[PDB]
């Protein structure tokens, strides 16, 4: 009824017999060519793994189990008296399929609560790192040391039967859930609130308003925000570098400590965790030199002379998807209610207005639509959140619900060991020499 | 001459060139389909990622740059008065693809001695750590809080060009690979040696030799072991877990200590980095239950009622080869010389006599030969490396010479962000239907 391990253990037979089907009729049908392009192009264009949590709609954005962003908005549970789904509700329909009940929600708040408690060990750690060892190194260094309380590896030890993998993978998934607000908050006042406490958990708040409390923050809309935020980051299909790492060390059977730590340390590359500084940094200096007022004319001239000079707009352009990333959708509408006079909203809302017709213009990238880094940055500024370095820790834990909610299921289902075949150019070339 | 640096900066064109002039050619042509089946299972047998290191031969085993394990033994560097390859020696060859003379080993050998030093911030670290936190959770904790000491990931952030980033890359992984032995030594050390320290690198002495001091043991054959296990464990092609990962992570430009802290916890699962213990628990027990001195009747017969349960031998009847591992073979050669009445040992050997044999008559298992896991547990306990959790951070030291030397190629060959398609089950039931 409201207790989501139930809910799953009944959920799981079904689907595996429907996969155990699925395999027997397709199991042999191909869904795409290898190239050595492919390759040596990082797997481009290659499908190579099965992640249920989330699809890319070409015309609707990310979908989670079915739902739209707008869909997830509208039918998602909000704090009470608040609008913004919480990511309860969303890790909920995550391993479900289904949209929570009140309840529901509810039961899982109080659950991330009681689970909450660090180890006195990860605390010391933690409050002994020095200031210049990055946010994200520190987190991910503290799960990783987190996992001595991983059931998990314990009961794997132990010898215990495969079809109960997921059961302790459930557990270990909803305490590092629970736990993670707590790390990515002491990270957050050790670096930048010289080592001042986090306060303690309350046991009938949502998870993203302890997690706010913690962080020293008292502003309902920075909750409201934040809620938002740890919701739509949550999840984006299994072949991004945090969910495929996930993916790729859980099937070692790996615990969720050991593979969300992984995960993070991949999202701490410049290639994947960094866009939401890097149109932030470029928005700062934009609005520095051309000043708050600027008129239509005059900065449609400015994203001219940027495309002009060979680079692009930061958070703009997609190579499928056909509109507006509607989580940029989402935060724009949130700026348009809390913060619509703030001068760096404006240049991002004039952004809007402006670049997807110039690059409709020069006819060069496919879709000149805004994706959700583009707004990110300016609504975590607005309410006092200025430590751009720290950003990728917020993307981190609402990634958190998306990786684990799947990392249940592929136990669930039995997904083996990753292990594709590796070849030197070598190898390559012999190979493509015969035939 | 000795300067690796700039023997790799000449390679590197070359290489460049090679592949850019077959991606022309050959760029679209089909090497394998992709089935239904090899999403759901792993992508096993599919061909998805260039790694240039090492190569499995189906008839022979493992290959480092085209030279199998035996012609490695024979040809790398070995120390003065020892007889088993210097680990420095391999790296050199998986960088290069060229067997090393003694100056440019020796050389490498004091690289890493000057290299060594720890942060006090990781030291500090490690010192708290307690007696209930794994050996590898504490190994990829400390490597991930070395990522302070990386030049790349600042050098990257003031806007370097792509040309140099191997350069940088080849920086923090010799950086690392210095480091490694410190981490390991200490994280023994603290939790059973009750905390002594590990003393002072030598700057005189290779890699594996610093080690053991470090670790505190001062037996040469312990040392000539150590320098054997970290040479024939260093790579393994680039689609097990830890190569992979440390493959996957640095696509995304982290920087060489994420990547390889990400490997680690992807060594440390169970389907990964446990086969050695899992051999010496089995063999354990087996000893236990039958003594030291049991017939091959009788042990041929409690490996039949093995079989007959439906278990399997461990470190015997993988899929992989036609043949012994070389590496067993390696450790096999190196028992025999030092301890060759070792009870352990012993069974060791009986079994290699008597499991085959069986394996081949039930006709079930591929490849009735053994790997390296089942030989690498019992000469480590047999010189008191009795500490089973910790032999996966052995494993890890080793490993760190394969997939740091391919990330310094990934790097200067600009292999782009690893990004698969992913699907779900419902997905891939519309695809196969439309
Ligand atoms: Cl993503
Ligand atoms: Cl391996």
């Not at 949209?99 to 689970?115: D, G, H």
């Not at 730590?261 to 030199?289: R, S």
């Amino acid at each position: 009824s409201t207790n989501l391990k139930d809910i799953l253990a009944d959920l799981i037979p079904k689907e595996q017999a429907r996969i155990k089907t699925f395999r027997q009729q397709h199991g042999k049908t191909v869904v795409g060519q290898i190239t050595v392009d492919m390759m040596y192009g990082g797997m481009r264009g290659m499908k190579g793994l099965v992640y249920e949590t989330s699809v890319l709609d070409p015309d609707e954005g990310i979908r989670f189990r079915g739902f739209s962003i707008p869909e997830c908005q509208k039918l998602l549970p909000k704090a009470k008296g608040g609008e913004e789904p919480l990511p309860e509700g969303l890790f909920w329909l995550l391993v479900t399929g289904h949209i929570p009940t009140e309840e529901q929600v509810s039961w899982l708040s109080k659950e991330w609560a009681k689970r909450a408690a660090l180890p006195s060990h990860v605390v010391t750690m933690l409050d002994n790192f020095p200031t210049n060892l990055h946010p994200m190194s520190q987190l991910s260094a503290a799960v990783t040391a987190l996992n001595s309380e991983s059931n998990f590896a314990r009961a794997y030890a132990q010898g215990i039967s495969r079809t109960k993998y997921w059961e302790l993978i459930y557990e270990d998934s909803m305490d590092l859930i629970a736990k993670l607000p707590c790390v990515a908050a002491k990270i957050y006042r050790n670096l930048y609130r010289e080592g001042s406490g986090i306060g303690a958990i309350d046991s009938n708040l949502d998870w993203s308003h302890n997690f706010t409390n913690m962080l020293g923050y008292t502003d309902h809309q920075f909750t409201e925000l934040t809620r938002l935020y740890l919701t739509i980051h949550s999840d984006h299909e299994g072949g991004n570098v945090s969910a495929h790492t996930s993916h790729l060390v859980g099937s070692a059977l790996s615990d969720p400590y050991l593979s969300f730590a992984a995960a993070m340390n991949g999202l701490a590359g410049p290639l994947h965790g960094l866009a939401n500084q890097e149109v932030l940094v470029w928005l700062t200096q934009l609005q520095k030199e051309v000043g708050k007022d600027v008129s239509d004319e005059k900065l449609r001239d400015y994203i001219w002379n940027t495309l002009n000079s060979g680079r692009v707009v930061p958070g703009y352009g997609h190579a499928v998807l056909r509109k507006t990333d509607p989580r940029y959708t989402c935060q724009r509408e949130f700026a348009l209610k809390h913060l619509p006079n703030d001068p760096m909203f404006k240049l991002v809302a004039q952004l809007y207005k402006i670049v997807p017709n110039v690059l409709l213009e020069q006819g060069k990238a496919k879709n000149p639509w805004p994706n959700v880094d583009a707004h990110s940055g300016v609504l975590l500024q607005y309410y006092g959140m200025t430590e751009m370095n720290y950003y990728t820790v917020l993307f981190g834990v609402s990634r958190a619900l998306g990786v684990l909610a799947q990392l249940i299921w592929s136990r669930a289902l039995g997904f083996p060991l990753e292990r594709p075949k590796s070849m030197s150019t070598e190898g390559l070339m012999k190979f493509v020499d015969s035939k």
